[PDB]
């Protein structure tokens, strides 16, 4: 509920299905601690990564296995992965949607925060 | 000189070459009057659309024929075109560059206004 | 149901609420005919614009009143609107989700087409 | 010459000036070795990161310090940075340009490979 990840395919105009997503949280010693992970569903959305209790303030990294996605579609991409690093600096009942739009040579990402 | 267009292909990671661009200016009867046109060069850029003298205050529409571009590459796109509508004001800055990033199911257009 | 529109604010990272959206369909005489309209909800989403019975093949213009959105936030924007023009064909998938991400000088738009 | 970075501020419609850029190259032991760095000029462009002789085939990471840019404008952005990882090949086009479009809650990064 507090964190959702959505992956779109800009070449085919479809949800990017079964894309692996890893989320890390920056630890007190500046290292990346593994936090949660999953695969996008048929809608391109990855729900249920975390809970309100666990998703505290911090710096989070979302790494998307775009290369495996493209290769499964018959595409050899130029980007090796997609990575989005963001901060939650607002505790409380805040909901984050991290959306990534993918192409073999490009990505775009948007964060929408709602209450 | 006062109005430039730059177009990139975010799927192939290249300038979008030979893309037709049409510029319109809103007439007193709220219809779009043809103003200028051209096609992008091998660098994805279109220079010389207009002159300082001809480029007066008004509401301008820039339409980039992305559909013909994608079709010539064998790619089925979503959009008929990519566009920006903006107002030229003589109190504001003096050079307008329309920067367009293209993919078959996603585009961005930005007005970059410089002095 | 066949057509959904979502509008996001790239400056604030929030849904764009109460944004007016007009959809037009190109008539056989090359004119733009009013087809449907609505305003985005608190989620930035506009549901129920049309029905399967009404949404036939054709060329559609989705015109988003970004100017009123920005002025309600105290901003006089450079883009006068956002416009997304596309063709629906019946041999392909039938549900279109059109998302637009806004700034006073830029927008990006994504199309997701499902069956 | 072989590697350039260009950054636009899509909220203000202007080149993103004085933006720090760090480039790393993957070493034989899978570690990221610092390769080059610089900052964008008044045109938003960063030239002279490297030379043809030093930019050999390999996997390169380009990290753009978007956080400091927004913070210098008084804005606490969502993202810590914008990054792309790509592979250079000698038997291919020999100029790589990373084009980045920025907003506080949204960005795109594209690799443009030209000859």
Resolution of the structure in the document, Å: 1.9
Q: A108 vs D111: CB contact, 8 Å cut-off?
A: no
Domain count, chain B: 1
Answer for the pair D16, D69: CB distance below 8 angstroms, yes or no: yes
Binding site residues of B, as ranges? 6, 45, 108
Pull the structure tokens for residue B66: 């992305």
- Residues of chain D whose beta carbon is less than 8 angstroms from a beta carbon of chain C are 10-13, 78, 101, 103-106, 108
Residue of C nearest to D102 (CA): C10
Pull the structure tokens for residue A20: 């692996």
DSSP state of C72: H
Chain centroid, CA D10 distance in Å = 16
DSSP state of C66: H
Answer for the pair C64, C100: CB distance below 8 angstroms, yes or no: yes
Which residues, at least 6 apart from B10, have a Cβ–Cβ distance to it below 8 Å?
Answer: A10, A103, A105, A106, B101, B102, B103, B106, D108, D110
Alpha helix segments (H runs only) across chain C: 66-72
Pull the structure tokens for residue B37: 């046109």
Q: Which of D46, D64, D75 is nearest to D100 (CA)?
A: D64
What does the alpha-carbon distance between residue A84 and residue A59 come to, in Å, rounded to a whole number? 11
Q: CA dist D10 to A13, A105, C10, D100, Å?
A: 24, 20, 9, 10
Pull the structure tokens for residue D83: 């990054």
Positive or negative, the CA dihedral D31, A69, D63, A32 is negative
Is A45 assigned a ligand-binding role in the annotation? yes
- Please report how many Cα atoms fall inside a 13 Å half-sphere around the Cα of residue D81, on the Cβ side: 15
Is A14 assigned a ligand-binding role in the annotation? no
Which subunits sit against D, judged by 3+ Cβ pairs under 8 A? A, B, C
3-state secondary structure B61-112: EEEECHHHHHHHCCCCCCECCEEEEEEECCCCCCEEEEEEEEECCEEEEEEE
Q: CA dist D33 to D49, D82, D83, D101, Å?
A: 15, 18, 15, 26
Option in A14, A108, A112 nearest C108 (CB)? A108
Q: Mutate one of A85, A112, A114 to test the D interface: name it (highest D CB count within 10 A).
A: A85
**DSSP calls for A58-73:** EEEEEEE-HHHHHHHT
Pull the structure tokens for residue C40: 């985005």
Residue C92's domain is classified under what CATH number? 2.60.40.180
Which subunits sit against B, judged by 3+ Cβ pairs under 8 A? A, C, D
Pull the structure tokens for residue B102: 């293209």
What does the alpha-carbon distance between residue A10 and residue A6 come to, in Å, rounded to a whole number? 13
SS3 content of chain B, % helix, strand, coil (to 5): 5, 50, 45
Beta bridge partners of D64: D21, D82
Which residues, at least 6 apart from C28, have a Cβ–Cβ distance to it below 8 Å?
Answer: none
List phi, psi (to 5°) of D66: -70, -30
Answer for the pair A82, A110: CB distance below 8 angstroms, yes or no: no
Q: D110 vs B15: CB contact, 8 Å cut-off?
A: no
Q: Which helix (H) or strand (E) holds A1?
A: none
The residue with tokens 């300082």 is B52
Beta bridge partners of A52: none
**Domain around D15:** 3-114
Pull the structure tokens for residue C101: 């991400």
What does the alpha-carbon distance between residue C111 and residue B106 come to, in Å, rounded to a whole number? 6
* Environment class of C53 (CB within 10 Å of its CB; exposed 0-12, middle 13-18, buried 19+): exposed
**DSSP calls for chain D:** --EEEEEEETTTTEE-TT-EEEEEEE-TTS-EEEEEEEE--TTSEE--S--TTT--SEEEEEEE-HHHHHHHTT---SBS-EEEEEEE-TTS--EEEEEEEEETTEEEEEEEEE-
The method of structure determination was X-ray
Which residues, at least 6 apart from D110, have a Cβ–Cβ distance to it below 8 Å?
Answer: A105, A106, B8, B10, B13, B101, D98, D99, D100
Residue of D nearest to A101 (CA): D108
In what side-by-side order are the strands of the sheet with C58-64? C32-39, C20-26, C58-64, C82-88
What does the alpha-carbon distance between residue C24 and residue C83 come to, in Å, rounded to a whole number? 11
Is D61 assigned a ligand-binding role in the annotation? no
Determine how many CB atoms are found less than 10 A away from the CB of residue A50: 18
Which subunits sit against C, judged by 3+ Cβ pairs under 8 A? A, B, D
Answer for the pair C6, C45: CB distance below 8 angstroms, yes or no: yes
Residue environment code for D46-79, b if the CB has 16+ CB neighbours within 10 A, otherwise e: beebbeeeebeeeebbbbbbbbbbbeeeeeebbb
Option in B11, B101, B108 nearest A11 (CB)? B11
- Please report how many Cα atoms fall inside a 13 Å half-sphere around the Cα of residue C48, on the Cβ side: 4
């Amino acid at each position: 509920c507090p964190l959702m990840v959505k992956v779109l395919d800009a070449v085919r105009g479809s949800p990017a299905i079964n894309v692996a997503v890893h989320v890390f949280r920056k630890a007190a010693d500046d290292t990346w601690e593994p936090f949660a992970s999953g695969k996008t569903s048929e809608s391109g959305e990855l729900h249920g990564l975390t809970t309100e209790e666990e998703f505290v303030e911090g710096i989070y990294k979302v790494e998307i296995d775009t290369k495996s996605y493209w290769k499964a579609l018959g595409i050899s991409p130029m980007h090796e992965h997609a990575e989005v690093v963001f901060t939650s600096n607002d505790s409380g009942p805040r909901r984050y949607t991290i959306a990534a739009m993918l192409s073999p040579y490009s990505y775009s990402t948007t964060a929408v925060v709602t209450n």
